[PDB]
Amino acid sequence: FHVEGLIAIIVFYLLILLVGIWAAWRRDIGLLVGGFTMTATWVGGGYINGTAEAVYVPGYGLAWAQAPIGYSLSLILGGLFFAKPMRSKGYVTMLDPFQQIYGKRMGGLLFIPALMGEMFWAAAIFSALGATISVIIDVDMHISVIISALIATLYTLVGGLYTDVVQLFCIFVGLWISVPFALSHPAVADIGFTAVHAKYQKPWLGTVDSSEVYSWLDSFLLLMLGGIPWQAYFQRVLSSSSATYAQVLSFLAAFGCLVMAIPAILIGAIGASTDWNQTAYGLPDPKTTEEADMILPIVLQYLCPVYISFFGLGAVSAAVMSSADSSILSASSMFARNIYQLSFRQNASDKEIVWVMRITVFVFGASATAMALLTKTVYGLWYLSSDLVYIVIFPQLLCVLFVKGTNTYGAVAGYVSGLFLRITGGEPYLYLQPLIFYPGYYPDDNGIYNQKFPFKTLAMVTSFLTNICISYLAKYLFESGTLPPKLDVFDAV
């Protein structure tokens, strides 16, 4: 087990690194490579393992696999709406507009939650990589994720002293070659039948009841409008040369990620349609055994022959471990540059960049490892990433950019209001019992209250209206008498 798995992973990762450095070593297609790399930024660890877990779990089903359909629509909306009002004014990055208007220091306050979201995303990628490595070499869960994160961070440290194209071909081959003949054991039932009638378990095409349609709408408008303000997307859009180039790139990336989500949904459907008693996985199912994150690696390993399995599985592991470096490097470099050019100053010649980036990558590897080492989900961390980005970035990025009005006062007021209406609202994925108990609450199996009434969307709306109202009242009273203009720290007058 151990030796063959290590051989496969080492061989395939060495090959992909050689191919990448060779392509870097030395027309009518240019958009397609850009589309592939931009959809390579989203895919990797997030979709495949995450959406496999979302489909497989009895209770979620496909109807609650909110992410893969959420983020393609996120790209479409972001391109079609924000692609135009991002060129004429002139924006180096998405961090620049916040520092341009809200004095400059408030950018760090606004990008501590985006940093937290990217921490969550890195934790999801690390958990996916740990799951795949643990399945392929059969050593353990907690050790595997720590080792994988250590390798990823060490590779980040010296990896800077085109790859993304080969990375997606690795995923596309690895999955689509392993499930034209995977649903062929005497165990796997008809993928069409277990969608609507339930052989081994409750149907993988999950059902949403009329009582909790509001939760669906909220948790789907969350993903749609929280996948847009991410740093990687706006870093790729602004470097695009032509105006319509950004729109075309976003549309092709959305189509690519929709096509890429197909091989992973069927994997979850197979996993939910098997008979985990005639295979080699023993009597317990991966549902009454908290290993629902490994559904995709388990179906790839056990429901495929020896030679077909490890090719695709090693390809998937290599692709996700490749994406880990991009995640960590962005999450460290953006923080270092923005906030240590924000706070006072630091000598950027030979000290600031080197040691602050080094300490940042070390601490972020440690934090992502600790964050993904305890939460036994791979979809939950990803969802919470998009969640917090939605709550406390999208309203302010929408009011600063789309039309007009946002002062600094409204920024802090909306920040406080949104954070309050969430942290008092309740986070079921973590062990955070709510404190307001919005009408329609139903207790969960664990013992953690979750709410049917929407409070993420309510938090977004409250933050936006708080920003607008506070800023316009500031424009009302910028004169004397009512709060004389002497008080001025961050100015709107």
Ligand X SMILES: C[N+](C)(C)CCO
Ligand Y SMILES: *[C@@H]1O[C@H](CO)[C@@H](O[C@@H]2O[C@H](CO)[C@@H](O[C@@H]3O[C@H](CO)[C@@H](O)[C@H](O)[C@@H]3O)[C@H](O)[C@H]2NC(C)=O)[C@H](O)[C@H]1NC(C)=O
The residues binding ligand Y (CB under 6 A) are 277-278
What does 335 bind: ligand X, ligand Y, none (CB cut-off 5 to 8 Å by kind)? Answer: none
Nearer to ligand X, 71 or 111 (CB): 71
Binding mask 360-389 for ligand X (x = CB under 6 A): -------------------------xx---
Q: Least CB distance from residue 283 to ligand Y, whole Å?
A: 8
Q: Least CB distance from residue 287 to ligand Y, whole Å?
A: 17
In terms of DSSP bridges, do strands 442-443 and 449-450 run parallel, antiparallel, or are they unpaired? antiparallel
What does 239 bind: ligand Y, ligand X, none (CB cut-off 5 to 8 Å by kind)? Answer: none
Q: Least CB distance from residue 301 to ligand Y, whole Å?
A: 18
What does 277 bind: ligand X, ligand Y, none (CB cut-off 5 to 8 Å by kind)? Answer: ligand Y
Nearer to ligand X, 40 or 474 (CB): 40
Q: Least CB distance from residue 277 to ligand Y, whole Å?
A: 4
Q: Is there binding between residue 126 and ligand X (CB under 6 A)?
A: no
Nearer to ligand X, 261 or 412 (CB): 261
Nearer to ligand Y, 242 or 278 (CB): 278
What does 46 bind: ligand X, ligand Y, none (CB cut-off 5 to 8 Å by kind)? Answer: ligand X
| Among residues 121, 172, 200, 390, the one that binds ligand X under rule CB under 6 A | 121
| Among residues 56, 71, 364, 415, the one that binds ligand X under rule CB under 6 A | 71
| Among residues 5, 34, 35, 46, the one that binds ligand X under rule CB under 6 A | 46
Q: Least CB distance from residue 123 to ligand X, whole Å?
A: 11
In angstroms, the CA 312 to CA 52 distance is: 16
Nearer to ligand Y, 187 or 399 (CB): 187
What does 227 bind: ligand X, ligand Y, none (CB cut-off 5 to 8 Å by kind)? Answer: ligand X
What does 386 bind: ligand Y, ligand X, none (CB cut-off 5 to 8 Å by kind)? Answer: ligand X
Nearer to ligand Y, 235 or 279 (CB): 279
Q: Least CB distance from residue 278 to ligand Y, whole Å?
A: 5
| Among residues 12, 13, 56, 230, the one that binds ligand X under rule CB under 6 A | 230
Nearer to ligand Y, 47 or 302 (CB): 302
List interacting residues with ligand X (CB under 6 A): 42, 46, 71, 121, 227, 230, 385-386
